[PDB]
C-alpha cells in the first residue's frame, strides 16, 4: 500500500514550505503564513491554519512527518480521509490558539497535530480493539520519548506544553467519541 491523499499532500506541502523557508528565510515565510500577528491581519483566514505547515529545523520536520506518515496514514487508510482532515483541522486550530495565548504568534509546525494523532490512535486501540487502529507497545515507548523531548524543551525550540496538551486533548476526545459510537 501507499499513503492516502491527505497524508501525502500534507507531507508534500510541509516539504515545499520548508524549502521556501531555507531559500527565503524563516521570517519571510512567517510573514505570510504565521498566525495573525497584527490586527490588520485578523481576517486573513488561512493564517489560523497555515502556521502548521512551517518547521524550524531538520529534526522538527523529520520526526513530525514520520509520526504523521505512520499515524495519519493509518487513520486515513482504516477510517477515511475525512477523519484525518477533521482531527488535523481541530488540533491545529486549538493548539495554535493556546500557543499564541501563552507565547505569541511566532510559531509553527505539526507538533500539536501529532500529539492529537498519538492520543487518538492510542485511546482508540485501548478502548476499541475492533477498529484495527492502535498504538503498538514498542511505539508507545518511542512516542513517549518524543513527547518528553518537547515537554522538557530538550532542543530549546519547543511549543508551550499547554499547546501540547491542547492537541493531545483533541485526539483523546475524538477517540472517546468514536469509541462510544
Ligand atoms: C519515529 C516515528 C515512528 C516511525 C514509525 C515507522 C513509520 C513507517 C511508516 O510505514 C508506512 O505507513 C504508511 C501508512 O501508515 C503505509 O502506507 C506504508 O506502506 C508504510 O510503509
Ligand atoms: C499527486 C496525487 C495527490 C493525491 C493523492 C492521490 C490518492 C492516493 C491514494 O492512495 C491510497 O492509499
Ligand atoms: C504547498 C504550498 C503551501 C502554501 C500554503 C497556502 C498559503 C495561502 C496564502 O494565500 C495568500 C489570496 O488573497 C490569498 C493569498 O494572497
Ligand atoms: C468566523 C466568521 C468569519 C466572519 C468574516 C468577517 C469578515 C469581516 C470583514 O469586515 C470588514 O473588513 C473591517 C470590516 O469593515
Ligand atoms: C493544519 C491545516 C493545514 C493548512 C491548510 C491551509 C490551507 C490554506 C489554503 O489557502 C488558500 O489558497 C487558495 C488558493 O489560491 C487562495 O485562493 C486562498 O486565498 C487561500 O486562503
Ligand atoms: C529514530 C527513528 C527510528 C524508527 C524505527 C522504526 C522501527 C520499525 C517500525 O516499523 C513500523 O512498525 C509498524 C508496527 O509494526 C508497522 O505498522 C509499520 O509498517 C512499520 O514500518
Ligand atoms: C522515535 C522518536 C524519538 C524521538 C527522539 C528525538 C525527537 C526530537 C524531537 O524534537 C524535535 C523540537 O521540536 C525538535
Ligand atoms: C483543552 C485545552 C487545554 C489547555 C491547557 C493549557 C494550560 C495547561 C497548563 O500547563 C502547564 O503550564 C504551562 C503550559 O504552557 C507549562 O509550562 C507547564 O509545563 C504545564 O504543566
Amino acid at each position: 500500500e501507499r499513503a492516502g491523499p491527505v497524508t501525502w499532500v500534507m507531507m508534500i506541502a510541509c516539504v515545499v514550505v520548508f524549502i521556501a523557508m531555507q531559500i527565503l528565510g524563516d521570517q519571510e515565510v512567517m510573514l505570510w503564513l504565521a498566525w495573525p500577528f497584527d490586527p490588520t491581519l485578523k481576517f486573513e483566514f488561512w493564517r489560523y491554519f497555515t502556521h502548521a505547515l512551517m518547521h524550524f529545523s531538520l529534526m522538527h520536520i523529520l520526526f513530525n512527518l514520520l509520526w504523521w506518515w505512520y499515524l495519519g496514514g493509518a487513520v486515513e487508510k482504516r477510517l477515511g480521509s475525512g477523519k484525518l482532515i477533521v482531527i488535523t483541522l481541530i488540533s491545529a486550530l486549538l493548539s495554535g490558539y493556546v500557543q499564541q495565548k501563552f507565547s505569541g504568534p511566532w510559531f509553527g509546525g505539526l507538533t500539536g497535530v501529532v500529539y492529537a494523532l498519538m492520543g487518538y490512535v492510542w485511546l482508540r486501540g485501548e478502548r476499541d480493539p475492533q477498529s484495527g487502529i492502535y498504538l503498538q507497545r514498542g511505539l508507545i515507548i518511542f512516542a513517549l520519548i518524543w513527547i518528553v523531548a518537547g515537554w522538557f524543551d530538550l532542543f530549546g525550540m519547543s511549543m508551550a506544553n499547554g499547546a501540547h496538551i491542547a492537541g493531545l486533548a483533541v485526539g483523546l476526545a475524538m477517540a472517546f467519541v468514536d469509541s462510544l459510537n
Side-chain angles (χ1 to χ4, degrees), residues 62-121:
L62 172 61
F63 287 97
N64 276 4
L65 294 189
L66 280 168
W67 283 117
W68 166 269
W69 184 28
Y70 180 68
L71 303 167
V75 168
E76 183 166 29
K77 175 182 181 174
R78 296 191 161 279
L79 305 173
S81 295
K83 183 89 64 180
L84 179 56
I85 288 164
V86 175
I87 296 165
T88 300
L89 296 175
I90 300 177
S91 61
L93 281 169
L94 186 62
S95 66
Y97 177 79
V98 175
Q99 178 70 20
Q100 65 84 27
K101 195 55 177 54
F102 294 172
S103 304
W106 305 102
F107 67 90
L110 283 172
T111 301
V113 171
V114 170
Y115 270 87
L117 289 169
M118 285 179 174
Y120 185 87
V121 169

Side-chain angles (χ1 to χ4, degrees), residues 19-42:
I19 292 167
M21 293 172 84
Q22 305 326 299
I23 294 173
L24 301 166
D26 286 355
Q27 304 102 306
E28 288 93 325
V29 173
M30 282 192 294
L31 207 57
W32 285 79
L33 298 187
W35 189 278
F37 51 85
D38 189 70
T40 57
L41 308 176
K42 65 194 179 309

